[PDB]
Design a protein around this nucleic acid. Structure first.
Lengths: 80, 73
DNA sequence: CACCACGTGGT
DNA sequence: ACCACGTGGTG
């Protein structure tokens, strides 16, 4: 835009700031959705570090749980 | 002091930021869609959210296949 | 000592 | 598009 390039400094500042608010809101949102996707804290409190941490923890748990399910499938597929 | 008081507050936050930085790393590596890719913190959170949901689904259905192979056998 | 958001300055 | 810092305030 041709207005954008010729806009005032007050206009530049305000914008820079507005874009950062928007960036932070996206992330705050994304932390929300991760929070709710993880049953160890489905929808209560939890600091950003806990969300990231319990999220890594869950992924590992699930993997363990998955290796266990697929064996019991193979072995039930032996019986069947 | 009142000055030395501020240095500490600041030092403790730097620590907070480092914890979150490291934790983003590990989450990054635990998600196969992000391995080897350059990702923004928003991507990591988003692609992670995606994976965790996928895993939950896929595990659930595999449970079903157990019940039905258990209802079959 | 944890937590958090903001404005700002730096690619 | 994105990121890290210092800050002021909360428990």
């Amino acid at each position: 835009n041709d207005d954008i390039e010729v806009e005032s400094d007050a206009d530049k500042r305000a914008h820079h700031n507005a874009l950062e608010r928007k960036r932070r809101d996206h992330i705050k949102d994304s932390f929300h959705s991760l929070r709710d996707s993880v049953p160890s804290l489905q929808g209560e409190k939890a600091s950003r570090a806990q969300i990231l941490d319990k999220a890594t923890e869950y992924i590992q748990y699930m993997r363990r749980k998955n290796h266990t399910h697929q064996q019991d499938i193979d072995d039930l597929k032996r019986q069947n």
